Amino acid sequence: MDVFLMIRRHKTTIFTDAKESSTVFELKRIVEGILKRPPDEQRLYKDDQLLDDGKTLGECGFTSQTARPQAPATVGLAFRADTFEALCIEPFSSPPELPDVMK
């Protein structure tokens, strides 16, 4: 079962998919191939919860029916500087006010 995600850190957003049966560590290996930082220098989060390496994405609550192509689930990411930085995700820009003609 495929799950569709947004792996987010600061102003970086990775759009990727993974199997529900795949692990948190295997997702760090995906991040490594893109951002060139090893899994030991990474922390993955579901909201404020730190995810354990050996757990499947499905056990972590990333399911095919919630982590959808058109509405992907967010995975937080923090790197180790050696100490890990606090989890920080920059919000996307705010949409302008609806035009009078649209309200």
Add this chain to the structure above:
Amino acid sequence: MMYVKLISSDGHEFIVKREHALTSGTIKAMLSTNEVNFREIPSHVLSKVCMYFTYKVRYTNSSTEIPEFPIAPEIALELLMAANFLDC
């Protein structure tokens, strides 16, 4: 390589599969160092464009029962402007 970077007007960096980004003729032309800057497309719009790529690849021919692609009213005009520029 396998991924490309799409940067919004407000500096958000969106990393997507090259094959997903190449679905847009505009992006394909802009790529040909695996990075494209969109000076007029803000993050609340570009994030939706990336979600569309995933949706299109997943649901094109087919597996049956396609869900609606959602667009909040507040983003609709700017997303229309971007879809028109990107030929999406």
Add this chain to the structure above:
Amino acid sequence: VLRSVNSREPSQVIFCNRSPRVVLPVWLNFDGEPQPYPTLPPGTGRRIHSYRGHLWLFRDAGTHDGLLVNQTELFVPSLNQPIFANITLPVYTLKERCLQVVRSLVKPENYRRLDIVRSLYEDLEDHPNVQKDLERLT
């Protein structure tokens, strides 16, 4: 050209709406004129009486947005057990989906008041319609 054949050979069909839209079935008569039929709510099915060689198309009842039937535009009942007509949403282009959302929020008299290029005002005004889809025809 695009018209039903007067076969007079009955063919039972299941119109199965697997879209989140209210569906308008449209029968193309013997002169090729579109005849609207009763609507189908979102996830409903109807066992209907049609004929071999008769032509049908399916639209969103409120906006006339194009729908697919058995992954194509036109449905022709064949020799029968009823023939299953699976009505679904197409994967609309992002531009077409955006045009659909804008049209649902703005009155046609107010399209001109939007701060967009003229070509987009024309795209908004060129709302889906059966007649334009029928022509062509090629």
